[PDB]
Amino acid sequence: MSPSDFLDKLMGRTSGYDARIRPNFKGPPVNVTCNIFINSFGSIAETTMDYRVNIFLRQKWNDPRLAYSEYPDDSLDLDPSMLDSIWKPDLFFANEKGANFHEVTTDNKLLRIFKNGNVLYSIRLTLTLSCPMDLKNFPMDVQTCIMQLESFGYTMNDLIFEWQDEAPVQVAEGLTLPQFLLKEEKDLRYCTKHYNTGKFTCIEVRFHLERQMGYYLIQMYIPSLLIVILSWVSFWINMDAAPARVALGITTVLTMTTQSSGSRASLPKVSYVKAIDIWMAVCLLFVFSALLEYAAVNFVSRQRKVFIDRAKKIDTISRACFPLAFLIFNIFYWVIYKILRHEDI
Amino acid sequence: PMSPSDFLDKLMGRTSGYDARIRPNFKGPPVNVTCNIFINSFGSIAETTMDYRVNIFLRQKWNDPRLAYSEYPDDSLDLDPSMLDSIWKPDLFFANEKGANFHEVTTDNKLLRIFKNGNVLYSIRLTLTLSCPMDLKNFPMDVQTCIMQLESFGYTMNDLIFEWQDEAPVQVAEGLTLPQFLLKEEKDLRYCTKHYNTGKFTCIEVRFHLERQMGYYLIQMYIPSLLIVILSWVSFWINMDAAPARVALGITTVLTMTTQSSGSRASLPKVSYVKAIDIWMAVCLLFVFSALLEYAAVNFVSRQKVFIDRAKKIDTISRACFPLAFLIFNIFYWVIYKILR
Amino acid sequence: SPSDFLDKLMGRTSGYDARIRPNFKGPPVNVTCNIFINSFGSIAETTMDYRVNIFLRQKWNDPRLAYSEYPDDSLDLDPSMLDSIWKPDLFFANEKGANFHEVTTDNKLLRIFKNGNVLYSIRLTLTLSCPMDLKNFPMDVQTCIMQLESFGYTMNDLIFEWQDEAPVQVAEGLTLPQFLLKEEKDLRYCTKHYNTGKFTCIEVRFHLERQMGYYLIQMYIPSLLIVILSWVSFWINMDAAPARVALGITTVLTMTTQSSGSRASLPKVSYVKAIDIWMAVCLLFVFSALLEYAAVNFVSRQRKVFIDRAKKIDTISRACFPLAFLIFNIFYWVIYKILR
Amino acid sequence: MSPSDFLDKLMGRTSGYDARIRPNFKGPPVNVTCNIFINSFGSIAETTMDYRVNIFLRQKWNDPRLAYSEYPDDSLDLDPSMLDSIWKPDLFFANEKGANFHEVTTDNKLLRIFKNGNVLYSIRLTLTLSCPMDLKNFPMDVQTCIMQLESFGYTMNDLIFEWQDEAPVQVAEGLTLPQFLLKEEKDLRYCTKHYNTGKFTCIEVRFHLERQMGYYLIQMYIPSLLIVILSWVSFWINMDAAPARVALGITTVLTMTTQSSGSRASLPKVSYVKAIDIWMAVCLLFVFSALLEYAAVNFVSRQHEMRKVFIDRAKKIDTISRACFPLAFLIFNIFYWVIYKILRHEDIH
Amino acid sequence: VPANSTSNILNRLLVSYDPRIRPNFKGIPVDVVVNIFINSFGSIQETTMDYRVNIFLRQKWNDPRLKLPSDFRGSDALTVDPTMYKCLWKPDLFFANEKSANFHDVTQENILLFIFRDGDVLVSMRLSITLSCPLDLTLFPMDTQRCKMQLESFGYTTDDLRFIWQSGDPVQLEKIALPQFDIKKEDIEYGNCTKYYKGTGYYTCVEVIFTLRRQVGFYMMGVYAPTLLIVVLSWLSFWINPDASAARVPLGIFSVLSLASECTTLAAELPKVSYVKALDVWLIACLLFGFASLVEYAVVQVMLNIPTAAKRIDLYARALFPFCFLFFNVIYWSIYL
Ligand SMILES: *[C@@H]1O[C@H](CO)[C@@H](O)[C@H](O)[C@H]1NC(C)=O
Ligand SMILES: *[C@@H]1O[C@H](CO)[C@@H](O)[C@H](O)[C@H]1NC(C)=O
Ligand SMILES: *[C@@H]1O[C@H](CO)[C@@H](O)[C@H](O)[C@H]1NC(C)=O
Ligand SMILES: *[C@@H]1O[C@H](CO)[C@@H](O)[C@H](O)[C@H]1NC(C)=O
Ligand SMILES: *[C@@H]1O[C@H](CO)[C@@H](O)[C@H](O)[C@H]1NC(C)=O
């Protein structure tokens, strides 16, 4: 009758309930249906190959030892401090770098016990999960990160995890990422890791992320385009100004080398060539070819002899051949990475 | 005759029989908790990681009939903060938080007060690096409204209800100031009442209207960019015959501001849209690029007659047009982003 | 037996209750606290805070800790036994974060005198916060604040105050990597007020004065030398147009870069600081030198009797500019001597 | 008889031993002998003025309450879990900023009890000790960082610290440093700090650290050395080529301002001047004077048989400068590198 | 017999078991078998001379005091709740070459405690240790780092505790990718060191030595190519007509300034060491080539004050610079292959 005596008779010292033994010992494995509710998503840094989530992890498992009939109500809420006196399913995230609980004025845990013995356990965590990156096309990539749930204390012979059939993964309304667009289709598969000591259960949820051009198209690509146009504008200067025209070719390579150094500064060290890397390296050839054309023109003019006619001819030939070359090559580079040879799932 | 230790054991102690594991009014009306905060420190707003830190003296009040005493004539009785662990507390957690911790220096920074009718005051010192999204459409003169959310976690709305205090719920410490922003005196108070699969949970929300002063930015990159573009105009009065002077002027004025834009963007998070400072710097870059381009056209005209007169004419046109264009652009840009949008 | 003495004094057999302050429902217990600074430094303006390492000590009197078994008056006890006696609440209000020091044991001291007085000293490490005014950046005087304050008990039950003599000690040989710590330290009552009640609070002020050495070497001197370099154009033959425009250009560029680098190490503040005026005015001088060159070049291109005018303007400027720079530099130091 | 009963009878609950009372209570102070074993070193950050160690701190003392006779064995090792249940001497590092134990698969502690009653106690630690440094001659400096053991609870009237007679500080074989080299000599002193509460025992050990110029030479001096070569290679350029000479001066001065900024970026700001600032400032003044000498020559060739014949005088000026500036720089190099290494500085050794 | 009763009679305060006493007290040392399962690898920061791993350290030994009674025969193994890892004896263990290590605790402790019939006990923990390995930077582009991980014992000497590696396949790892290095699974050579600390006694230490071979792809695509372009620009400066006398200085001076910036940036990016590096050799060679171009231009300008001599000097220098550079580059690559 008394609620404190009821709790003591249910799971207290007088109860005789044991938290050291899993339910249904030496019998069928205990099925644990879990689902997560993402609260905060972000800090997806490519340098450290990691990202941070903030999930309301929940679990639902059945035990017969927690059956009660004194209270007519079926669903009952308990103090979160009762959780140490009941059996819990071991559950650790395999692909993580650092995680912690959250306590403010109390632990952020919810415990609910149903009449038939079903238990709803939910705890608030914060995970710095690790997911591999692919930077073949760095500004136009579709990077998918993973969150693995796997048991550690018991093999699959005793503990089995599986997602909830309806609404397995939720996202808070108004969720957004600073640079990415989280998809709405989230895949659910089975990892089921198999170590030499035993075969352990493992549940995996996939996350799909797509990067936008918004920051890069306006910070990275456009300045290089205007630099190449600056090196371009040399052809229209008079050829007698030997130190004047060459100055543009001198400065463009320096500034674009500095821009290239800054471009890969905030990116992880990778062997393969990145899309921004190839774009800017190939743009380097154009600004260097401007200086090469000037050197050829000056050498021709510096050995009447109709050489000035040939110098103007090569000047206009360059000023008419660079447009087609850039306008065709850059659009080809765009289309191949967009659809033709990359991206497109 | 009643020793205080015996009284404490009689009211909340082991002899009392009070159970801290059961909420007040069990199987009854939901327990209401009127909570109010007291900001002590504010600031450290960093846009790169999109959060801010507060140092609040969180307080809570609720009624618990099991803590009613009539032995002591005094009504407001204070207790040792270590007594908290032996009495019930209301669950609470800050929904939009990234890292939280108490403050333990020579003791726990907690305060317990118990009234005659059972009303309990419990104030605990916290420190929260709450997360608040920002709209950076007009970055130098933005208006951010960061949010602090208080919410129950364990008990549902059917058992625990959070309500702001009637008057003066959120205060600010005297002399509180920020290095970059202005904290408005008004602070909006609204409910949110979030719900999930488990059920409906009570919620509490407070809005801190923040505004930015352009004092630092105007002197850090607005004035330098204007001075650099003013430098770029001095090429007009240089004789068209002399190439290297005008070439160097144009080249350096173009080059010196790309690094300015990179440095300005370095301290800001990556964003898809375009910020106002970005628009200003891009327009100045276009202006200086056109300043170099017009000189290129002049040099083309001079080098093919009396075309030198036409070169002087176009130079004068540029000299009389570029200041006008920059003035009209400046008066256009400093009006819409400042007042209209 | 010492174990029996400890048990009878304040142990399990004693019946002492650690949850009740001395003189319960009576006069407030007066607590005298004096600190001992061990290491002072790590003063960073970027986060607007500084780190100390104090040997905080407290003294209070309680009648329940009086003994007569031991003739000796000053008794030292194991620090691990501190959990069984009443300890006054004490938190540092202007603290951004603090932590104890546990190395091989708890760093605590307990001392019980015969009359009942108790000495309690605990080592700490406080990252306090102190707002700074940057009106005179290289020659400012900041007063960073240490605030002791009670939290659990109101003024009606706990009163703090400094010792009569030698309240704050600084370890011999202590020095600041950045500033010059003064010997004078103000001791004022703080006495904060809240809506819960009246809470006692104790304030001690540290006078910090900045040393101009590093700044003078690294930031003023290059600016002065660079603006001196900007003057080298005035002695060059006017024929070399690119030679003069070049030095003007690179001087302007390098001074802008120096401004960015100098302000990269300070917190963003709405108001202008002291250093920015010097550097901005020197940059304006370099800019005006380039502009005067441009004007003289215009004059040269309109024996036209213009060579005399161009040389007159160049020579007049070559002497007016040093006078203007000297008078501004003297005025800029004089105004800051007026402020301080 | 049984080992569990032996442990209970020696110092367990049935024993009656009290861990809250120091041995030899109200008697002579319990002397403690400590000796450390360094396992790693390095991360000497000049900016923050601290260094990290990883020591196997050890202690020895006596207490008659732990004397045993049932077991003939003398050196008996015990589980570190038991270690919290015996009296231990208070100890802390005064000039520390942050330290912690190491708990991996167990607590990294050791407890040993000898027959005569002596106790051994070795606990792993990790100290971010603080040591102020003097940077009067930074690129070629010598530093003496310290590790200051000290008691905190008991006064010198109840606890005395002292080093071991033989090999007090041991260093694990093969240890090296990233920026310095650790001298084999380690001075030991007595610090015996005094406070307003009493006389406290204190033990200080000296570490001598010397900085090798391997990185700093090739990163600062040699590039700054070649910049001034670039500066004087203009003197062979004809005065006629005015833009070449002036550009050769200004780029050289600008790069040296940038290099000075980059050099000072790695040190805490100090009111006093350092060696690297002297070198950088003088060598930069040299290129500044080279550009100014260009300006003077160009003015001379610009009107200072009635001929000006100032070309010959300008050529003489250039010839004198081309033979003076490299020579003056060479004598400055020798004088500075000897004066900051032999006679009045670098005598700290 | 209830499982509660079996657990109580096996290891509980209600049964004669002392966790503070090692098995076979004052007798044969307790042989311990250890095997590691790498999970996460990387974050090899050369600047701090350390790297971070994430392992599943598994140790199994013998304990006659833990014998499953023959009353019930359910399975050879018997899983136990992880919270009883603190109720039975454990072997003292730690990593000597470790800087900052910690356990993991998410929703439960990550510990598994098997118990076999004959008395053998299997124990595994999930650890995230930050080991430090002394990197050698003599040949930066084609270096081969040798980072190791050595276990040890602290409380017990070799007379009580002894570590032995697994008989077969002691170290495992499944499809771990690295951003900068290429761990070789076959090259997993490992011995043992049996560390001897003076003043205390012997202490067993079994070590694993990982062999890492850095790929030079990133550096080749990022650092060496701009240097090559600067060298080609210096070459192209040669063909400029010397009559201008001011259109050839800027190329060389700006090239040497770019090289100065590059070497400063690379020094800032790299940890500070005293010895020379191959990358430093490349940078100083490039800067020396720029200086040679500058002095060659100075010589040509001096000789211009004769035009035949200047043309001959230009032709000879343009003939010797690229072939000499190519020979130097080829021999440099051959030395540091
Ligand atoms: C757990 O689910 C499995 C199938 O996945 C089933 O065989 C077993 O009986 C279930 N155990 C229960 C419901 O206790
Ligand atoms: C508590 O307040 C709620 C609304 O906040 C109200 O419905 C309720 O009646 C109050 N009192 C009790 C005893 O539940
Ligand atoms: C504390 O000091 C106050 C000062 O007014 C005094 O009234 C009170 O009696 C003192 N209490 C003591 C000494 O216990
Ligand atoms: C411990 O050493 C001190 C200092 O030398 C000495 O006075 C004392 O007698 C020694 N022994 C004991 C048992 O205190
Ligand atoms: C450890 O090294 C010692 C060296 O004496 C050797 O006797 C022993 O067999 C080695 N053990 C293992 C497991 O490698």
Short mmCIF file of N, CA and C and ligand atoms in Angstrom, two decimals, chain D residues 24 28-31 160, ligand 4:
data_model
loop_
_atom_site.label_atom_id
_atom_site.label_comp_id
_atom_site.label_asym_id
_atom_site.label_seq_id
_atom_site.Cartn_x
_atom_site.Cartn_y
_atom_site.Cartn_z
N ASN D 24 54.82 7.33 15.87
CA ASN D 24 55.62 8.01 16.89
C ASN D 24 54.93 9.30 17.33
N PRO D 28 59.55 12.02 18.42
CA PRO D 28 60.41 12.54 17.37
C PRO D 28 59.68 12.57 16.04
N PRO D 29 59.98 13.54 15.18
CA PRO D 29 59.30 13.60 13.88
C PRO D 29 59.68 12.41 13.01
N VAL D 30 58.70 11.88 12.29
CA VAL D 30 58.92 10.72 11.44
C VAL D 30 59.64 11.18 10.17
N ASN D 31 60.93 10.91 10.09
CA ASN D 31 61.69 11.27 8.91
C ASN D 31 61.26 10.42 7.73
N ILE D 160 59.95 15.30 8.45
CA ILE D 160 61.18 15.81 7.85
C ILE D 160 61.44 15.03 6.56
C1 LIG F 4 64.35 10.79 11.79
O1 LIG F 4 65.25 11.73 11.27
C2 LIG F 4 65.35 12.91 12.04
C3 LIG F 4 66.18 13.92 11.28
O2 LIG F 4 67.51 13.46 11.18
C4 LIG F 4 65.92 12.58 13.43
O3 LIG F 4 65.90 13.69 14.28
C5 LIG F 4 65.08 11.49 14.08
O4 LIG F 4 65.65 11.03 15.27
C6 LIG F 4 64.95 10.31 13.12
N1 LIG F 4 64.23 9.18 13.68
C7 LIG F 4 63.02 9.18 14.27
C8 LIG F 4 62.57 7.82 14.74
O5 LIG F 4 62.32 10.16 14.43
#
